Amino acid sequence: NQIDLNVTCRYAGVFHVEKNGRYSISRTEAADLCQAFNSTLPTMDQMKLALSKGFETCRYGFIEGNVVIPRIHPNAICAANHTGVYILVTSNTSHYDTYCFNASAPPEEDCTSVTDLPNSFDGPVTITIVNRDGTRYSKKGEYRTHQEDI
């Protein structure tokens, strides 16, 4: 019973989380997941400030109110070559990655690794945080509060 959470650098407190190497997070699960990192879904303003500090991904993820991809450099297979916070407009489907915002993180680029899941609760799942440099932190617990997300 295992969940892998791949996480990025934080930029003005904003970071990306991909679950189990595939788009697999619902909007309700995303809020609960960020809560386990003492974080919240970023506002569009928080995400724009993270972008300005160097944040970009090539994956759709929730923020408050929308699903987006932050882009700095144009790439034809990432958000159809757009730059800025690209907003998903049309999709049949509901599951994506998530972004999270930690207000206590550093103000600019923080590419140190993540070594804790501070606000998960008691549960049976082995949750493993996987950093980009491969370092891992694991703990037994749960973060999902909605039964339909389990």
Nearest-CB residue to ligand T0Y? 123
132 is annotated as contributing to ligand binding: no
Residue 123 beta carbon to ligand T0Y: minimum distance, rounded to whole angstroms = 4
Q: Which 62-91 positions form the footprint of ligand T0Y (CB under 6 A)? A: none
Helix (H) or strand (E) holding 35: helix 27-36
Q: Which 103-132 positions form the footprint of ligand T0Y (CB under 6 A)? A: 121-124
Is residue 134 a contact residue for ligand T0Y (CB under 6 A)?
no
Q: Which residues are within 8 A (CB) of 90 and not within 5 positions of it... i.e. 6 or more apart? A: none
Would you say 122 or 148 has its CB closer to ligand T0Y?
A: 122
Would you say 52 or 145 has its CB closer to ligand T0Y?
A: 145
Torsion of CA 117, 119, 125, 128, to 10 degrees: -10
Q: Which residues are within 8 A (CB) of 57 and not within 5 positions of it... i.e. 6 or more apart? A: 8, 16, 69, 70
**Strand pairing report for 136-142 and 121-130:** antiparallel
Is residue 4 a contact residue for ligand T0Y (CB under 6 A)?
no
Residue 32 beta carbon to ligand T0Y: minimum distance, rounded to whole angstroms = 12
Return the residue of 4, 64, 109, 142 that touches ligand T0Y, per CB under 6 A.
Answer: 142
**Which single residue is written with the structure tokens 């617990």?**
141
Cα separation of 14 and 22, whole Å? 20
Count of other CB atoms within 10 angstroms of residue 74: 11
23 is annotated as contributing to ligand binding: no
Annotated binding site for hyaluronan: 22, 59-60, 86
What is the binding site for ligand T0Y (CB under 6 A)?
Answer: 121-124, 142
